[PDB]
C-alpha positions in Angstrom: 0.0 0.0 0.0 2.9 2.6 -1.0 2.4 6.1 -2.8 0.0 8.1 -0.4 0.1 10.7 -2.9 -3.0 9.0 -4.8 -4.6 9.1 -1.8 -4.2 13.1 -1.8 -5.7 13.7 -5.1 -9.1 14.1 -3.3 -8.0 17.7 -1.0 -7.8 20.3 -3.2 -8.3 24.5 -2.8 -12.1 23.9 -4.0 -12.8 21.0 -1.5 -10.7 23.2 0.9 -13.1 25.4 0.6 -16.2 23.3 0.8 -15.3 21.4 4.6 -16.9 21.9 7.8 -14.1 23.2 9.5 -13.2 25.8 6.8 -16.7 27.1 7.2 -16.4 27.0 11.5 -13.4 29.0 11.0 -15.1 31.4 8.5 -17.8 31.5 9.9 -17.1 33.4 13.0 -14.6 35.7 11.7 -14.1 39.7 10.7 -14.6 40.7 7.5 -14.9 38.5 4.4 -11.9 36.0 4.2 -8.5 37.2 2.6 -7.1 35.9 -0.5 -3.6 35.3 -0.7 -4.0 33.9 3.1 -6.3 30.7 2.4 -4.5 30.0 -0.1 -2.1 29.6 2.3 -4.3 28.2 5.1 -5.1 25.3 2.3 -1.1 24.6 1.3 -0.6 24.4 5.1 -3.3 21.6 5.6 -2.1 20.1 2.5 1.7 19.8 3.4 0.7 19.0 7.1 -1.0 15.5 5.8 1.8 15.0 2.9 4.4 14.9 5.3 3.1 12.3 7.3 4.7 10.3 4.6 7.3 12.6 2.8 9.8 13.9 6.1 9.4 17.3 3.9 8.5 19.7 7.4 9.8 22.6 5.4 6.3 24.6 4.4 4.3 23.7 8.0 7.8 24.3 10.5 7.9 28.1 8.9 4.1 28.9 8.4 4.6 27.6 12.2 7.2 30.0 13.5 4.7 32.8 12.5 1.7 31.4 15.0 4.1 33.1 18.1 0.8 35.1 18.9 0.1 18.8 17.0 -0.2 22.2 15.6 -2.4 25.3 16.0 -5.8 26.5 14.9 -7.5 27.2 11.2 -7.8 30.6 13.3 -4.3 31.1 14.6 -2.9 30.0 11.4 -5.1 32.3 9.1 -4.5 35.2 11.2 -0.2 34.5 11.4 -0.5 34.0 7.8 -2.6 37.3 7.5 -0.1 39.8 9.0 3.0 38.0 7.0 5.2 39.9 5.4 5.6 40.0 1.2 8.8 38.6 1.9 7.3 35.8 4.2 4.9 34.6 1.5 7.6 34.6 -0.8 9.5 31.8 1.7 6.5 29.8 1.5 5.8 30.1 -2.2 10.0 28.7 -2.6 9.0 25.9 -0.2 6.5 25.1 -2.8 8.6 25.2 -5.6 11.5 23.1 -4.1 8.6 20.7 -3.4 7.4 20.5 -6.8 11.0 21.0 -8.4 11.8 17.4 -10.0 8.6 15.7 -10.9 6.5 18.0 -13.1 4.7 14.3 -13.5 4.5 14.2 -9.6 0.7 14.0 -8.5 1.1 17.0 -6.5 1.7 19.4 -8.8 -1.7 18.7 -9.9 -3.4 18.9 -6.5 -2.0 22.4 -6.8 -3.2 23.6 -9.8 -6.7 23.7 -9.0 -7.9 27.4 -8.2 -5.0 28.5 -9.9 -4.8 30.5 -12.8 -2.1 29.0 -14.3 -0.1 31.3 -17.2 -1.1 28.8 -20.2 -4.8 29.2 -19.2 -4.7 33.0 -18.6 -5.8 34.0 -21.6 -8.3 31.2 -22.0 -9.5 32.4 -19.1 -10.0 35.6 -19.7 -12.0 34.3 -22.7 -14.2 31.7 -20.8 -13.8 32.3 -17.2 -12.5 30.2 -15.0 -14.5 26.7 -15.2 -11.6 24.7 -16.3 -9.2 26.3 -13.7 -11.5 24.6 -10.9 -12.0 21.3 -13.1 -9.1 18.5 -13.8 -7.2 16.0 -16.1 4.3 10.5 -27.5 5.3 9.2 -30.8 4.8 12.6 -32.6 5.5 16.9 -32.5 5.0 17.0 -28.6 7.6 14.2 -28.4 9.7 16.6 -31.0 9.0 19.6 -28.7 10.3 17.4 -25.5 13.4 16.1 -26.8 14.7 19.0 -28.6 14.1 21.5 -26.0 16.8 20.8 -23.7 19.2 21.3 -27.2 18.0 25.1 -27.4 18.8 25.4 -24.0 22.5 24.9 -24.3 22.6 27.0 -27.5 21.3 29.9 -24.8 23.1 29.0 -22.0 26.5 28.0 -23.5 26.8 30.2 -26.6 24.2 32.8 -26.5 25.1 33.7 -22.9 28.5 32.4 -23.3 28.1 30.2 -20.1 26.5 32.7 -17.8 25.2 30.8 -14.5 21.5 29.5 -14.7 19.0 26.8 -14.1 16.4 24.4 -16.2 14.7 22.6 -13.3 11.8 25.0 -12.0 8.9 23.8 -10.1 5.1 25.4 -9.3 5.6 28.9 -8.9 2.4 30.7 -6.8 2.3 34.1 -7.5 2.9 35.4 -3.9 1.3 38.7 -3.3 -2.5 37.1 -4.3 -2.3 33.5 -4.2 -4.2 33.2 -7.7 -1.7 32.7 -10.7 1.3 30.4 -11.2 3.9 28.9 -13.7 6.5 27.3 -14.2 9.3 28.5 -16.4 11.6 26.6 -19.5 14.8 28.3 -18.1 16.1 31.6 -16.4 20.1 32.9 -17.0 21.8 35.0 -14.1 20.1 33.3 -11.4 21.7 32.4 -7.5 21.1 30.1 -4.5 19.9 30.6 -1.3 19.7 26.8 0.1 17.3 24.7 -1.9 16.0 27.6 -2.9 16.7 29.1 -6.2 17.0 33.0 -5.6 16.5 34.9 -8.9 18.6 38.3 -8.9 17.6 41.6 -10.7 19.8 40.4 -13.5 17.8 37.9 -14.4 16.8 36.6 -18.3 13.6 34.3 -19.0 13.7 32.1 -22.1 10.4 30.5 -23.6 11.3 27.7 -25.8 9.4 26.6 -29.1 10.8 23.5 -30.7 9.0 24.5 -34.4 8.4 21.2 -35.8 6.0 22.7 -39.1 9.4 23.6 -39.8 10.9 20.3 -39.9 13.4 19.0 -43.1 15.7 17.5 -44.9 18.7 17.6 -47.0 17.1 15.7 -49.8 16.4 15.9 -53.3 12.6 17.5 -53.4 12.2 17.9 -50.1 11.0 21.8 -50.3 12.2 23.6 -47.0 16.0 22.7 -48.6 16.6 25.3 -50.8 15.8 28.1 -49.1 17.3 26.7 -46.4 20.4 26.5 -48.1 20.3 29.8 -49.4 19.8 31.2 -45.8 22.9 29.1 -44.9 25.1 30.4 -47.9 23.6 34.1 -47.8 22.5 35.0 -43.7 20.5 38.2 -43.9 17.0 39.2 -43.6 15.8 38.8 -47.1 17.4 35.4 -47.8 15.5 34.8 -43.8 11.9 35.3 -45.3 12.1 33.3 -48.0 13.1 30.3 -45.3 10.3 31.4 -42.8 7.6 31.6 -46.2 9.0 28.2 -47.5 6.1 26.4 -45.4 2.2 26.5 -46.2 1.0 28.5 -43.1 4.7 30.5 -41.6 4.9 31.7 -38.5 5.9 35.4 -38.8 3.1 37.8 -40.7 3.3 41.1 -42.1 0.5 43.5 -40.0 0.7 47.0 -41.0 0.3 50.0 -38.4 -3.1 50.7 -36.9 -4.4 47.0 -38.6 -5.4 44.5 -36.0 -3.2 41.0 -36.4 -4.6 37.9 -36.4 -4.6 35.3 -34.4 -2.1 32.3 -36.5 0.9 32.5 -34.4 3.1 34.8 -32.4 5.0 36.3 -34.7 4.7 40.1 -35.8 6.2 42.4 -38.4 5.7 46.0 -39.5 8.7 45.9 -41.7 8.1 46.5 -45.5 9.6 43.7 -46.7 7.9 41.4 -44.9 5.0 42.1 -47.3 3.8 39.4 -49.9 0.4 40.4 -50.1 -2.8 42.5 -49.2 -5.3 44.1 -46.1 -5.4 43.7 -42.9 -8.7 44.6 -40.4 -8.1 47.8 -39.0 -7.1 47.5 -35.7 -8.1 50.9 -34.3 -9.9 49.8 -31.4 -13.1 50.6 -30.9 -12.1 47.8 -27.9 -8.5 47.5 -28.0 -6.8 50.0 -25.8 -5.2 46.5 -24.5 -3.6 44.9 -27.5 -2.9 48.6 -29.3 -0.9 49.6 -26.4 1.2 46.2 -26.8 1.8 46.8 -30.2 2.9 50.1 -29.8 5.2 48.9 -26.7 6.6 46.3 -28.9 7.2 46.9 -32.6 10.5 47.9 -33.5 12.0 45.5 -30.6 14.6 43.7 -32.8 15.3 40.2 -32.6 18.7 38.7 -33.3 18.6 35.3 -35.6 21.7 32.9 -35.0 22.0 30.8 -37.7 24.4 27.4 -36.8 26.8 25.8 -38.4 26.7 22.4 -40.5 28.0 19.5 -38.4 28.4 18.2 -42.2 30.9 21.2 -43.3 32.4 21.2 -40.0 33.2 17.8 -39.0 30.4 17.7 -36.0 30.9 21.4 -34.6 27.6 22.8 -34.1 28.5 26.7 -33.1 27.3 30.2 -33.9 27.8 31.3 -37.3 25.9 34.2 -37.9 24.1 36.7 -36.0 21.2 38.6 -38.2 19.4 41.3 -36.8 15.6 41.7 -37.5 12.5 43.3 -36.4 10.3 41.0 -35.3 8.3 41.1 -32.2 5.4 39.6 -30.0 1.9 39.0 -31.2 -0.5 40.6 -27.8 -3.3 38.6 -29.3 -1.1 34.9 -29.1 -1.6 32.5 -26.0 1.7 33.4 -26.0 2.3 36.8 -24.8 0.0 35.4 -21.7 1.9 33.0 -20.6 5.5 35.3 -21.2 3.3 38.3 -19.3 2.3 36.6 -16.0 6.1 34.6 -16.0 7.5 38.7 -16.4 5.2 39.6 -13.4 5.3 36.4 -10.8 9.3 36.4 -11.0 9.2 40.8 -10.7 7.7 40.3 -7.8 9.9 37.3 -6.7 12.9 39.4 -6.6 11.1 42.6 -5.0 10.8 40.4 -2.1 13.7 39.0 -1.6 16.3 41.7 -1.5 16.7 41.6 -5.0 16.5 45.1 -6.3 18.4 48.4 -5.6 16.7 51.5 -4.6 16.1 53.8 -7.4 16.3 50.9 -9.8 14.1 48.3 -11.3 14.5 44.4 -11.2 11.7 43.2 -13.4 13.5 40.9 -15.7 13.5 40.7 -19.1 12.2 37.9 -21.2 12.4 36.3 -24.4 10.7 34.0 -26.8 12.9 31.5 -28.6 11.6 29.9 -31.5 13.8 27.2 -32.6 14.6 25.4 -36.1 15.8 22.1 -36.8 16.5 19.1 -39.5 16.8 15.8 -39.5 20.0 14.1 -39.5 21.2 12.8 -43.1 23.0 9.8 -43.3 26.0 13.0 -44.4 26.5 13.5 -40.7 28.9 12.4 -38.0 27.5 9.9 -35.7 29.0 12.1 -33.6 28.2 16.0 -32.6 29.0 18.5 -30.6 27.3 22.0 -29.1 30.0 24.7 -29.8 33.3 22.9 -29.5 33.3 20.7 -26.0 29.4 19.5 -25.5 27.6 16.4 -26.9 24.8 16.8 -29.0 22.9 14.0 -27.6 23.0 11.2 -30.0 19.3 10.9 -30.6 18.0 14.6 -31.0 17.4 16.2 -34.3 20.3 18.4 -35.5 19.1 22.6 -34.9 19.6 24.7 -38.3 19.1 27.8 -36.2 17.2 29.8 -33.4 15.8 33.2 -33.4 15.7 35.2 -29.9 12.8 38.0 -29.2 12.7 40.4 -26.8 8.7 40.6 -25.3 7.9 44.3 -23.9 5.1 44.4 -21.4 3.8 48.0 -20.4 2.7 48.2 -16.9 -1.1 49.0 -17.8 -1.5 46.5 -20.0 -0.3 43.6 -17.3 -3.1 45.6 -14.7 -5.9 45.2 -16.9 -5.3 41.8 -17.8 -4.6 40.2 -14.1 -7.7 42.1 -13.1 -10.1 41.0 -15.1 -8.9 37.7 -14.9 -8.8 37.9 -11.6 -12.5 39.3 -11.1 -13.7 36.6 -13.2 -11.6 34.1 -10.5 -13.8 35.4 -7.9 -17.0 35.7 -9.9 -17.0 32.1 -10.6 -15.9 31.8 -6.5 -19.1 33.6 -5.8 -21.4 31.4 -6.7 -19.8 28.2 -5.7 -18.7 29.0 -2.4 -20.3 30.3 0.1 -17.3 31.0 1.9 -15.6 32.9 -1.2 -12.3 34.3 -0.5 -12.0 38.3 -1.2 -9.3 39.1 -3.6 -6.4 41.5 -3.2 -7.0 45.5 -4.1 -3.8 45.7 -6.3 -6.2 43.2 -8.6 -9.3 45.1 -8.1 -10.5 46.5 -11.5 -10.6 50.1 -12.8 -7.4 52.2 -12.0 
């Protein structure tokens, strides 16, 4: 009778919400109750039972050295965790994550996501309220997407960031000043340690990664992405860079001239004039679109920087950085996408802010990218054996990368307000008539200002 995890599947926030004693304890009590607290009230109960089994006493020993005022009361607790300090909830939240840190395919990591507004299911959310947040739950491109994406993290770490410290492992990350969203993140650069803790300093780089397997090929007779692949390869510049990203049916970057409203294909943007193969576009003066206007004109004119790689083929297995192409290319604000880079940007800001992380006078809000990688298959032409830049196995079984193009995402302040809050509000609409003991929600999320 071993894995009492499976056993814990059952007590999550919403049935946290729904017991007995929850209700006692709110019942005689001051105002409504507080939101980021029972979210913490919840994770303390949680953790309490889970290390019956798991020695992991980390979480319950601190949210117990704050209960100065066989453990102590719903009450005691909620009102400990109530005057906590940002910087306290931020302890608890790095708890979690250390928790959660190996195992993504742990059970737990589940448990937790319900109630949470996770950052792939912010914008979903924001279309469809929140039912799904509150609900539950490889031979092909997702297989492709999970073998290839620790590749594109050594081209970043090793070469991009010429070796700059960082880490790939992250767990659940609450975000700790409301208790509401999450995420997880692909990889941070310029990152430090504080125990098991991973302390991210004001110097600190996100990276997205997107395996693009539409974009798949070969080094074959016919095979149609080829050429212009070749070309790119032989000639590196912008031009030569278009005709490889148009060599596919549906490509991923599209042309979206000023004050015309993008689409929704992928997350790719471009106001640049060459970019241009053909027509209109909707016009995107907003008649409702303050939000993605405002993005758009926050982001256009960022310019991304293309690396193209070297040809283990031409270079006797040395797979390093040969080229370098600037071009302006930037975010699409109506993509999944920007979402999920948006709430990473936020959570982490507010990660460092409270945890000594930022100099007065100065801003610690990281910066993040999207990375959008290309590869090929390997020809029979190729070394059995390769390497990342001059010293690093390319493991033998992952496809060999053709190149990688890096993009700066720029999120104005306003815009990240309105979207958290209506989210948000929608979080506790859907609370409000579920629960009778709904949980109130932070001001800095109210909705208006």
């Amino acid at each position: 009778l071993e894995d009492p995890m499976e056993e814990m599947t059952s007590y999550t926030f919403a049935r946290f919400l729904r017991s007995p004693e929850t209700e006692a304890f709110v019942r005689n009590l001051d105002r409504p109750p507080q939101m980021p607290a029972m979210r913490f009230v919840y994770l303390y109960c949680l953790c309490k039972q889970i290390q019956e089994f798991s020695g992991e006493t980390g979480f319950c020993d601190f949210v117990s050295s704050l209960v100065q005022e066989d453990g102590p009361s719903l009450k005691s607790i909620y009102w400990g965790l109530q005057e906590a300090t940002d910087e306290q909830r931020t302890v608890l939240c790095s708890y979690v994550e250390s928790m959660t840190r190996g195992q993504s395919e742990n059970l737990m990591w589940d448990i937790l996501r319900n109630g949470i507004i996770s950052s792939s299911k912010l914008l979903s959310t924001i279309k469809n309220g929140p039912t799904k947040v509150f609900e539950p739950a490889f031979g092909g491109p997702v297989a492709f997407g999970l073998r290839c994406e620790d590749t594109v993290k050594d081209i970043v770490c090793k070469l991009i960031c010429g070796d700059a410290s960082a880490n790939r492992q992250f767990g659940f990350m609450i975000s700790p000043t409301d208790g509401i969203f999450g995420v997880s993140l692909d990889l941070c650069v310029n990152v430090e340690s504080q125990g098991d803790f991973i302390l991210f300093t004001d110097r600190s780089c996100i990276y997205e990664i997107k395996c693009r397997f539409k974009y798949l090929f070969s080094k074959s007779e016919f095979d149609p992405i080829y050429p212009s692949y070749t070309a790119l390869y032989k000639r590196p510049c912008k031009r030569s860079f278009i005709r490889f990203i148009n060599s596919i049916a549906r490509p991923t970057v599209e042309y979206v001239p000023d004050g015309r409203l993008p689409s929704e294909g992928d997350y790719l943007l471009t106001q640049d004039e060459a970019w241009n193969l053909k027509d209109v576009r909707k016009r995107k003066l907003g008649p409702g679109h303050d939000l993605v206007a405002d993005s758009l004109a926050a982001n256009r004119g960022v310019e991304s920087m293309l690396y193209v790689m070297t040809d283990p083929s031409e270079n006797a297995g040395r797979i390093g950085i040969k080229d370098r192409v600037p071009v302006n290319i930037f975010i699409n604000p109506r993509h999944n996408y920007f979402y999920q880079v948006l709430l990473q940007y936020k959570i982490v800001g507010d990660y460092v802010r409270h945890s000594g992380g930022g100099k007065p006078g100065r801003d610690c809000s990281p910066r993040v990218n999207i990375v959008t990688a290309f590869f090929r298959k390997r020809s029979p032409l190729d070394p059995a054996t390769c390497t990342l830049g001059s010293d690093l196995l390319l493991d033998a079984s992952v496809e060999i990368p053709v190149a990688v193009l890096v993009t700066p995402v720029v999120l104005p302040d306003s815009v990240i307000r309105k979207t958290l809050s209506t989210a948000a509000g929608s979080w506790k609409a859907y609370a409000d008539n579920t629960f009778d003991t709904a949980p109130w929600v932070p001001s800095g999320l109210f909705a208006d200002d």
